[PDB]
Amino acid sequence: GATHDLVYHSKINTFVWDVEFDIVLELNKCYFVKCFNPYRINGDFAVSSIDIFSEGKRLLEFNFKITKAVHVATSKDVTEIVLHLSERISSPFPIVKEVVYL
Amino acid sequence: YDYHFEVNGTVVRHKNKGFGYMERFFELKESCDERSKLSKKQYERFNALFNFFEKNGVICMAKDAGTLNTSIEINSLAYHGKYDVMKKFIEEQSVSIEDDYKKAFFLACLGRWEESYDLYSNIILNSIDESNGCVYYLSQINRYRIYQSITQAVTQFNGYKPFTDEFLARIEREMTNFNIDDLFNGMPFEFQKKYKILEFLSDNQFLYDDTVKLFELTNKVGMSSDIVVLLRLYDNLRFLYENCLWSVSFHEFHQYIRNSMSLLIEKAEYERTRDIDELGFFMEYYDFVNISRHFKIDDIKNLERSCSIDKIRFGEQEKIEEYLVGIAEEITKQFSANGMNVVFYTQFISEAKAALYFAKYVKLSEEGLGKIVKALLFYFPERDLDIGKRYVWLERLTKCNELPKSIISIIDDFLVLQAEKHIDQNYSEVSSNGLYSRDYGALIKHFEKNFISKRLSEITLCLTQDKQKQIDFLFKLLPLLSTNAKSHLLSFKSVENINDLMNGIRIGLIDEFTPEHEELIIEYLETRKVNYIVYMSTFGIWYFLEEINNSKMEEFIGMDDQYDFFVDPENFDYKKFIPSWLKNYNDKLLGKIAGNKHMKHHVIEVLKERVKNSNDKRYLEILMNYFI
Amino acid sequence: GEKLKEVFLMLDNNVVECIKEITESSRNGKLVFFVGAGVSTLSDYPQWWRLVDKYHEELYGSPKKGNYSSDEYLRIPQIFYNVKGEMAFDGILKDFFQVDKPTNPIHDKILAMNPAHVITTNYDNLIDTACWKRGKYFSVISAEEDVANATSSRYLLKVHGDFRKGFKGENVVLKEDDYLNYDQNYPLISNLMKTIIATHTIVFIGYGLGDYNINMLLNWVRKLQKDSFHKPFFIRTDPSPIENETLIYYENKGLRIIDAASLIDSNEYDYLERYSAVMDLLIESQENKFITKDDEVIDYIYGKISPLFALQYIRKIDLKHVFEYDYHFEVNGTVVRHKNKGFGYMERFFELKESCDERSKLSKKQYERFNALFNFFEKNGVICMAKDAGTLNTSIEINSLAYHGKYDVMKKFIEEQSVSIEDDYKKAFFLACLGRWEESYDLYSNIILNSIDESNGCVYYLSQINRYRIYQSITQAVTQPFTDEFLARIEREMTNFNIDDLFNGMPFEFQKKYKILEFLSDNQFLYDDTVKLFELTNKVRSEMSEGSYSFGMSSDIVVLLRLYDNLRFLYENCLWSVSFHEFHQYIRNSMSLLIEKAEYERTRDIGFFMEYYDFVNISRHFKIDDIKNLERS
């Protein structure tokens, strides 16, 4: 029940909200940031560039079946809503934890 | 409640029942003959009042005008930064109590709050006997202001110990019942009518009047209200800085300047963009200093995402250059050896971050950009500005200016320095963006395109196979080094890695399609078919831009619709293409989707449909710039 | 802390009463301390017996055989002054009294009881320079011509003089010689001392019972009449407990003894902890950490809220100024805590509001007071604190016939006969609204003339303010209708109006109970929510350029509810200052930026649902061109 922090940042169709992922792509304590550089010099052809953290970079292969998501500072895992918002949005990385907006 | 005194120096009359005495004053000021017919002492007094009203800018009344010019000039070394001159001015010996007062304010500005408190208390103790109690009264006020400053310093920074707990208990012992509201109403009879106008300095929320005047600049409005509010703004800054008041640093003032040039810039935006019908705010040095100092970084970003500041012209570029060279030089002295005064650090870093953010629009010079870029990359600390945001700031700086050779040499020195810090196999490369040093390489590959590194090539020639991260840092920055170096680390290659070297091309492998690797792409598509029968769009994009020459990707169409969307555009059904899928493409890729014929005919319909649905304007801006 | 709590539990009845009257006299702004040497000598200040020593052995040689009696303390230096000379006497005074001693910590708490005046029998620079440091001004008087320059209304009455004008024996009262003819050398400090003593609450701290000053004062007050003077207080900090008989005797001459030796258990040379024992027992009574049970919390709220049972509606910004920098009162009806050192009394109030059982266990009168405070805080919308929420609803309702137009009902309400002075007040405001300024002026003047005798001067004060407001209205009407008899009469009688000291001429009751109404004697009190509108500028109006459907609570509901707080204040308290240009400026710009931000909110796709009150505000406070400007924006 952490809908009081859930945004729908929609220049890049994300959901900026601090959760902590547990993925199988086996890992623990993953959180994501995303960029918005549409004027990126020589950096593939995409604006958004994920920068997956695992307390530092993972140095990234990828099937991203998330196993356990839990909201920071208010517990009781929000995994059903993460699957629901994963089902609605057909994009890479629905729940991103920060957005830079370059 | 006599004559209204206007913001341009003019005087109009109001509620004065009696002789026009200002009128006889200005008539005696104009003609010398009437000025002559007077006794000695009050002719000298007329010279004194004359010097006063020319010093405060108050000129002849509203009967005669046309040459109304307002050249604003804050002559204070605390406004222009000038920190090394400030310290220099501190260490001399005082001769007067006014010198004591300015030294107390200057020393208060540059992070030294204790000695300024003590010098304040010295002014209180050594001027109570002497008359004209303004310097005394202002010293008292400022002493309580710096007391609130210090207790704010133990309010926040303990949430390292800046001050010792002897001083922090002494002032808390002596200043913990301060009720300033009757301070002026305990001053003598002389100081209760002569300096009766200073009664707002025993309060803080005296900002009300010009704040409501800003709301005229809201309330929905030759000469406009802009020059009124701007000159009243400069009146405020010249007051709080030339009278050396410490209440300039509290939050209400930064609130006021913040919102003031917020609405001035928003109204210039609402002024030149009046061109519905027929078809401003020229920056000077003081506007640059105010934007750098009183705004924050996010707020200047907010002004850029609200008002087109690229339209806004800039003047006096050499003095702005002196402020930026001075601000970078003071960064250099801040981190040459030592001096990390945490107070002055927090202030000076906020100003330096904002000024270097706003320095994009400024036409810098050769050596200026040299000192700025050098102090930005080398000396400027971490934990506030990290290595990705130095590409934000740096690329922001190094786009408006045509890059000189020395700047590329300095950035090369930064890359060699980062390689010399990748000699330890624990170097984290922290980044709050996701931008990294490969983008620094991309910068040099953008503005030179033919740059061969020399000493980095020497590092790759003496490269040893015992430091993997070092090799990796030489391996992401691949298109910069010599051919023998290419033999050396291109020997250090693993070709079986399909989609690491892909997954984000993390090394810059887009330089070549080494043909076994594109056949590797093809056989990967065969493996896709294999693990079908009973990331990926990038492959499709690499077919879309005429890069991979094998066409049999049409056999692998049937799993990903976006794969069909870049491989076979004709036969793909343009009725279930999700639009989402377009807010994540580059300007070149959207330009080349716009460069087709059967693509555009359908995406105009779907994109216009999603624009037409509620209000989506990413689709409308792409629709008006790429697709049209 | 807990020790002094037990001291408060183990007080006598009369002691607790004395703590009450010293504390409430501290709260009235009327509490004059008459301090002495025992307060000043714990800053290690040289006492007089050392000077009788040094002037003695510089007179006779031959150090003292036994001890000195009373008169020798005045007699032996007097000998020196007559025989040895001026400059030797002033030189020895210059030696012993050239000290730069720091302050006694009880000086901090004497000056923390909000004193009206400070009368001293000292010779130093401790209290005054301590007052310069603690940012107050006390008029430092030590001479005849110092009285003529009474630079403030707070006096530091040094009745014996001071060494400010040099270390000269001519300047201070030390010899016998000045105690003999004291009513011939300082006649005006005498008259001012009698003045301040007769007109205040006097507290004696640092003296011995039988000191010559106290003997003179008791002689004078026994020459006075007996119904008239306020009996002063004697705080006795001696090493010995006072016996009952001299206590009863000094109760009969007019003093009230609060003993300090009988409250604590202290040593013989332990003065400082005894001074600080009584003085902290007073300070903590101000800070109300001695408030423990139901009848102690429910009255302290009542004693600050029963004044505001008269007004119709009070803002939630000013209600912070009622409970002086206590709990922050938010714009949704929630209460959060801030700077309250003491018992959570609002917390016990809301817990007593929730459960009925604790609400039951109380006496009759203050259960009725709890019903009254309850009706108040539900009427102003102030609900339970931030620990429990979710049903936070703000249904705004201005119940006034001057907001909804209702002009025919207004005239109908005018023509009936009044029964109260409040009915007179609303009829005056209504009749002022519908273009009738003269009869509303006269009815205002009727409220001034017929409520000056009766208490609770809020209706009186607001009538005065509104009468000047309607005066400014009428002179605006001849600035830009009325007969020139009236227009010359009010211009005859209202042409020097300086409202700035009107509230600071109101009685002691109307200077603290309705102290929050002090902005009504001004106009540019709109500053706060105006800067809050600039938060709605400061770019949380950023929210367009980045897509953000941010589902929660923004600054919009804050500024909107503060707007409705403003309108409900100025219309339900029937204030005529709602029609002046600054208010229309404020509402104008307020819904300007609210509508502009809703424009900067739904168009983030790279709100502001109108009700009746929004329609009335748009029609009334905007102009035609400005609504056109909103349509073109």
Numbering used by the authors:
A (entry chain C): 9 to 33, 38 to 55, 58 to 74, 78 to 119
B (entry chain B): 336 to 494, 504 to 565, 577 to 634, 644 to 898, 912 to 1005
C (entry chain A): 12 to 491, 506 to 631, 644 to 670
Authors' description from the paper:
DSR2, a Sir2 domain-containing protein, protects bacteria from phage infection by hydrolyzing NAD+. The enzymatic activity of DSR2 is triggered by the SPR phage tail tube protein (TTP), while suppressed by the SPbeta phage-encoded DSAD1 protein, enabling phages to evade the host defense. The protomer structure of DSR2 revealed an architecture that consists of an N-terminal Sir2 domain (residues 1–298) and a long C-terminal helical region (residues 299–1005).
The resulting 3D reconstruction achieved an overall resolution of 2.9 Å. The cryo-EM structure of DSR2-DSAD1 complex unveiled that DSR2 in the complex also forms a head-to-head tetramer. That is to say, the two adjacent DSR2 C-terminal cavities within each DSR2 dimer exhibit the ability to bind only one DSAD1 molecule. This is caused by the asymmetric property of DSR2 dimer at each end. DSAD1 only binds to the partially opened cavity but not the closed one. Comparing the two cavities of DSR2 dimer, we found the closed one is too small to accommodate the DSAD1, and the conformational discrepancy of C-terminal domain mentioned above also prevents from DSAD1 binding. The surface view of the DSR2-DSAD1 complex structure revealed that DSAD1 engages in simultaneous interactions with two adjacent DSR2 protomers, and the primary interaction region can be divided into three distinct interfaces. Furthermore, the superimposed structural analysis demonstrates that contact with DSAD1 induces a conformational change in the overall DSR2 structure, which may lock the DSR2 in the inactivated state.
